[PDB]
Amino acid sequence: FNITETYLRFLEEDTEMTMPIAAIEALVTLLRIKTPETAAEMINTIKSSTEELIKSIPNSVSLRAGCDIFMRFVLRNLHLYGDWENCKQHLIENGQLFVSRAKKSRNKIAEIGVDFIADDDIILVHGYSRAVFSLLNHAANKFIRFRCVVTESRPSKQGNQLYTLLEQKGIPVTLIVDSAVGAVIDKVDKVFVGAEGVAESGGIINLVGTYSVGVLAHNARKPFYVVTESHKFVRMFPLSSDDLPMAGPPLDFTRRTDDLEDALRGPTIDYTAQEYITALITDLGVLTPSAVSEELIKMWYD
Amino acid sequence: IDLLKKARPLSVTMGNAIRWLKQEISLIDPSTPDKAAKKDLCEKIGQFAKEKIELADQLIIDNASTQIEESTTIVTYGSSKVLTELLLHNAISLKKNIKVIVVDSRPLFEGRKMAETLRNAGVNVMYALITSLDTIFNDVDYVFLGAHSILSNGFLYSRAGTAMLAMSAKRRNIPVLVCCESLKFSQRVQLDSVTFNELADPNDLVNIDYENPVERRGNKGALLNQFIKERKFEKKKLAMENKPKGNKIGGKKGSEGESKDASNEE
């Protein structure tokens, strides 16, 4: 039946779906075919499927996290010590429901937790996240005065895309160079983030250049922030400043081989430390200081 | 000089002036006609005054002119007369927008006086106190600091919470710059607010705010009356080095990192 097929199914639309929410739904669908009463024929098989999915990955991180979340939910489900049927039914139900809840969470984020850009505080944003854009659009809707700042994305020309998505609203924006990042910290207020995953240590699993940005923020004491749909805590620990589970090579040292070729392999995933989160926008209420760690503890009961 | 010392400690500029006077005295021989002598001596003194002060000020102004952008928001502290003059010039002579912000402390009403003067000339002023500074910053674009004396370290020996302001500037967006006279520099050096402290009587905060001469009945006035109480203060503090990058004198351009580059040339 495949989760991979389901994943393939959604491509051009989305924007509304939220990472694991779709993956979780797919998993649920996979489950509700091959008898969800038994535990020996089921949990192990699910795990195997997840492993297969992991193996099959080109460049995607949060899937694992989603799977883990699903597993946790499943574990939580069977503790009532009554009957196998009701619990099974509940399990079957909880996928579409979960998806629905995601939308609610997004709505909450967009109406309640949007009081960080209000007094024309110029926002420094890089890394395309859907939640960020939702926040932007709903700020425009509320008329809550604002200005936008985006550093040019040029590994695969997502910058242009971002610019286009900003033209829909109809508000002036500017191009920024990521080497001349030290040149402009003057009028732009704070640095906000759209990323790929939330770390076990505390920092953020993000794209091409972030550590430098973080450093600059620290120098300027203009607080660093992360804007996300809050269920992307990937089971990964960045123990050092340059060591992680990565989709590609870590700063690939290439040999002088051909003419104008082996250089375009830019390190398109990078990390910054735990002592940077002044606030993180979470759908379970605005909670940050050591929240991710707490969540992890709650999950692994340690 | 001794009398002056007894009254209140003096500045480096004054010392320099004294030295110059001594040199002049050494120069003119006593065998010359007396009437003829001081006729020329006075002229020479006048010339010196014109050059090492007014001309220096002019030079400072011209430096500011080339450097300062098309209309600027300006922040200052104290009673830095040269800077006030420059501000006035900007307002009235060359004619540009002057959103000038002045900060002031409790013991001295220098800032207030400056503000008053600006008002009298017709300037839009923003008045500030100790409790907060950042309230106007978090907007503030270009800042000049209060000046008194410079050392051969690259540091500054200046008035009140200027150091705090400098620190704030360093933290938030942009560094600070100070313009001075070419005869302000010393060859003596220090690096803390414990080295040499400039003191007056602890009485500026005894009177409950408002005006200076009041004479009131209340509660304040316990220097020795109650069970052990001390009400001490400071006037001059240490301004830092890494933050005031700019220094402009009679030699036009340079950095405070070049702490005694002009001392050989003079």
Side-chain angles (χ1 to χ4, degrees), chain A residues 1-255 257 261-301, chain B:
Chain A
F1 216 88
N2 292 302
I3 176 156
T4 315
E5 286 176 55
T6 318
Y7 232 79
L8 285 155
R9 281 185 191 179
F10 326 107
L11 266 157
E12 56 267 68
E13 284 283 306
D14 213 64
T15 37
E16 209 57 305
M17 300 212 154
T18 330
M19 260 312 106
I21 222 65
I24 290 153
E25 209 282 315
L27 283 154
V28 167
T29 55
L30 208 83
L31 166 86
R32 58 193 173 182
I33 308 156
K34 285 93 82 71
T35 57
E37 196 188 65
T38 50
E41 283 177 63
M42 219 70 213
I43 311 157
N44 289 256
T45 49
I46 290 154
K47 199 71 201 79
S48 78
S49 78
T50 58
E51 252 85 64
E52 286 163 63
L53 165 139
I54 292 157
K55 285 154 192 177
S56 70
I57 281 166
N59 37 60
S60 57
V61 195
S62 61
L63 272 157
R64 302 190 192 184
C67 109
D68 104 64
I69 289 155
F70 172 77
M71 273 287 282
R72 204 86 270 171
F73 202 82
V74 167
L75 276 142
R76 285 212 84 259
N77 263 302
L78 191 72
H79 287 297
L80 299 152
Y81 58 85
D83 58 303
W84 315 117
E85 278 193 302
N86 294 7
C87 188
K88 185 224 278 176
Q89 280 193 249
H90 275 89
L91 282 148
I92 286 154
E93 211 170 61
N94 283 256
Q96 283 178 294
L97 265 67
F98 225 95
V99 173
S100 293
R101 272 276 169 185
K103 277 195 173 183
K104 188 195 265 193
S105 296
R106 198 176 174 98
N107 284 300
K108 278 194 85 185
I109 297 158
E111 280 286 301
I112 302 155
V114 280
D115 284 293
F116 263 102
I117 308 101
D119 203 66
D120 205 67
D121 288 56
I122 297 100
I123 341 151
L124 210 150
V125 187
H126 191 80
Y128 171 70
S129 186
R130 281 80 66 186
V132 180
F133 232 94
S134 78
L135 286 217
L136 191 148
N137 290 12
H138 272 271
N141 272 247
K142 277 265 181 186
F143 265 119
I144 306 194
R145 246 201 277 168
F146 54 54
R147 218 171 197 172
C148 302
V149 142
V150 165
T151 65
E152 187 200 294
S153 184
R154 209 195 78 115
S156 60
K157 296 161 189 176
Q158 198 269 123
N160 293 293
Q161 160 210 307
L162 210 48
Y163 139 83
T164 56
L165 288 141
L166 287 148
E167 288 176 309
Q168 298 190 276
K169 280 295 117 125
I171 280 132
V173 286
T174 184
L175 192 102
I176 293 96
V177 193
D178 273 304
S179 48
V181 58
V184 173
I185 331 154
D186 51 295
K187 281 176 268 185
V188 186
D189 292 63
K190 300 148 275 181
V191 188
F192 283 68
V193 140
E196 288 185 60
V198 193
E200 190 107 22
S201 60
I204 211 83
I205 320 298
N206 214 335
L207 286 153
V208 68
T210 44
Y211 187 83
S212 176
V213 183
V215 158
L216 278 143
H218 185 77
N219 275 253
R221 254 280 152 95
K222 303 275 185 178
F224 212 93
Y225 300 103
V226 179
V227 186
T228 33
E229 212 99 301
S230 66
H231 47 259
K232 280 186 177 73
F233 340 101
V234 204
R235 208 164 190 180
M236 278 158 62
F237 196 87
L239 56 148
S240 83
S241 297
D242 207 293
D243 205 302
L244 266 152
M246 301 157 295
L251 289 138
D252 208 358
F253 298 96
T254 41
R255 310 262 79 168
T257 51
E261 279 170 52
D262 281 295
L264 291 151
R265 285 176 184 171
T268 44
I269 291 151
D270 269 295
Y271 179 78
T272 182
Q274 68 175 71
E275 282 284 304
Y276 285 96
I277 354 143
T278 36
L280 159 66
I281 305 152
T282 53
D283 57 72
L284 290 148
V286 190
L287 42 94
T288 304
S290 186
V292 193
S293 62
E294 253 216 292
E295 283 178 299
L296 290 148
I297 286 151
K298 286 153 200 169
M299 285 193 283
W300 334 126
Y301 38 87
Chain B
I1 291 153
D2 283 307
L3 284 152
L4 287 151
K5 284 178 182 178
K6 279 197 275 178
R8 194 179 162 182
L10 313 171
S11 71
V12 159
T13 49
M14 292 177 84
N16 201 293
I18 288 155
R19 283 205 198 106
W20 189 261
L21 286 150
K22 281 185 181 180
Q23 192 206 303
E24 284 292 305
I25 291 153
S26 80
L27 278 157
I28 290 94
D29 53 301
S31 61
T32 51
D34 302 297
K35 280 185 176 182
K38 75 159 283 291
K39 191 184 180 178
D40 287 58
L41 260 146
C42 284
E43 280 183 62
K44 281 161 187 176
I45 297 156
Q47 281 280 302
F48 155 82
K50 284 183 178 181
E51 288 155 61
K52 302 218 180 182
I53 311 151
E54 203 176 69
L55 262 144
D57 297 356
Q58 189 202 248
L59 286 153
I60 288 155
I61 310 307
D62 77 53
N63 272 62
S65 288
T66 47
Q67 206 159 319
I68 280 150
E69 287 172 58
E70 304 278 316
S71 74
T72 47
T73 307
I74 318 137
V75 194
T76 35
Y77 188 84
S79 60
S80 55
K81 198 207 165 189
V82 284
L83 275 161
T84 78
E85 285 182 304
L86 173 58
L87 295 165
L88 296 180
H89 148 94
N90 292 309
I92 299 146
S93 72
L94 272 173
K95 299 164 188 177
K96 261 174 179 171
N97 286 45
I98 23 85
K99 299 171 189 176
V100 188
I101 309 153
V102 185
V103 199
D104 195 50
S105 62
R106 261 217 73 178
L108 47 94
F109 288 89
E110 288 174 35
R112 155 256 200 172
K113 197 152 271 190
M114 199 202 284
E116 281 266 312
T117 56
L118 290 152
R119 208 226 91 264
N120 290 306
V123 183
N124 278 44
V125 197
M126 300 182 195
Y127 188 83
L129 279 139
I130 314 151
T131 48
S132 74
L133 323 171
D134 266 63
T135 46
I136 207 81
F137 289 77
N138 290 298
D139 297 288
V140 167
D141 303 309
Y142 314 101
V143 190
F144 287 90
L145 277 164
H148 161 67
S149 62
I150 330 150
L151 309 148
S152 287
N153 307 292
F155 281 85
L156 211 90
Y157 183 82
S158 62
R159 275 158 271 174
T162 36
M164 321 255 271
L165 269 154
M167 188 267 282
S168 76
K170 181 69 187 178
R171 281 278 190 267
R172 315 148 227 273
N173 313 308
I174 40 91
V176 226
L177 304 94
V178 191
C179 307
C180 283
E181 285 86 69
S182 61
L183 211 77
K184 267 195 171 180
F185 284 97
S186 64
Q187 298 288 81
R188 207 187 77 183
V189 285
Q190 50 215 59
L191 247 100
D192 52 79
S193 296
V194 201
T195 44
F196 295 97
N197 186 32
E198 222 153 308
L199 261 155
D201 279 290
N203 285 305
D204 282 295
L205 271 73
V206 177
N207 294 304
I208 318 294
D209 306 67
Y210 294 87
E211 286 184 58
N212 295 287
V214 278
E215 295 173 305
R216 284 180 178 180
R217 192 205 281 184
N219 192 61
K220 256 209 150 196
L223 284 149
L224 283 153
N225 286 304
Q226 285 299 310
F227 290 90
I228 307 152
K229 195 176 177 69
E230 287 173 58
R231 306 149 95 187
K232 278 280 168 188
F233 74 99
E234 288 190 54
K235 273 184 173 177
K236 268 85 176 287
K237 344 275 167 146
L238 185 96
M240 292 170 80
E241 180 268 294
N242 65 303
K243 309 156 185 186
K245 276 176 189 163
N247 252 23
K248 297 151 221 162
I249 56 275
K252 193 161 187 175
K253 286 189 175 183
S255 71
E256 211 160 57
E258 317 147 41
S259 64
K260 45 175 169 183
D261 257 2
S263 287
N264 276 45
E265 199 176 19
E266 281 192 68

